[PDB]
């Protein structure tokens, strides 16, 4: 069975996360990247 | 079977993801990115 | 069977996502991106 | 079984993830990431 | 059994990850990489 | 400042999320659930 | 300042995530969560 | 500065993260979980 | 400064994370949890 | 300077982590927790 079958000529693959970039002032509670969490 | 085919001659995947990207001031509670998540 | 045929000469896929971007003043409670979350 | 067939000329995967990149004052409770994480 | 058949060219991964990178200033609970921690 | 002041007398926040809930049968490309992605 | 002021008398905060949940037959490709990816 | 006050009588966090839970039959690419990931 | 001040009577925090929980078959590529990653 | 006062009567903390829990069959490659990797 073909469980992926990936033809091409040329395969890039990029990713980027980028958390909190540049910020003012952080007061109280801040969250950049929340992930299945809870506060 | 084929699960998946994939036929082209250039394959390009680019993901961003940019959080809380300039910010002019954080106060009390703030959330640049929840996923799934409760305050 | 064919679960997906991607036939075709050229495949990009670019996704961007930006989130608080540029932002006078953030006060009490702010969220610049809320997945299946809550306050 | 083919459970996975790569056919390309050039595979290129490249990630970035940056955590609390530039920050002009964090108080109180600050994440710049949180994984399944409680606070 | 073919688990995993990789043909390509030239095979690049280049992962990065940087955690709390330039910060202001961090008071009372700060978490720049939290995985399936609890605090 | 009063960035945000609750008042109440009893507070109760419950979220569910259930994706691919009960399926005939999924065939080629499916997704339960996609959250700024791409296919 | 008050950043954030939570008065109440109980705070009950409860999140249930699942995914995948009963699936008569995955074929191809299949998501039962994606998050900022791509594929 | 009061960042952050909680004020209550009793705080309940619980947070449920299931993938994958009971499926039929995982053929081909199948993802019960993608956080800022890609294929 | 108060940075943070938790008030209460009782705090309860519990977390779960299961990953492939009872599958039926797990054929070709398979993530039953992806963080930051890259296939 | 108050980093974080925790006022409480009863603190009960409880994390659970459980990958690759019942399996029916894995084949080729499968990942039942990733985080920051690659493959």
Request: charged share 20%.
């Amino acid at each position: 069975d073909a469980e992926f079958r990936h033809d091409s000529g040329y395969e890039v693959h990029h990713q980027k996360l980028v958390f909190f970039a540049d910020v003012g002032s952080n007061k109280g509670a801040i969250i950049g990247l929340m992930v299945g969490g809870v506060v």
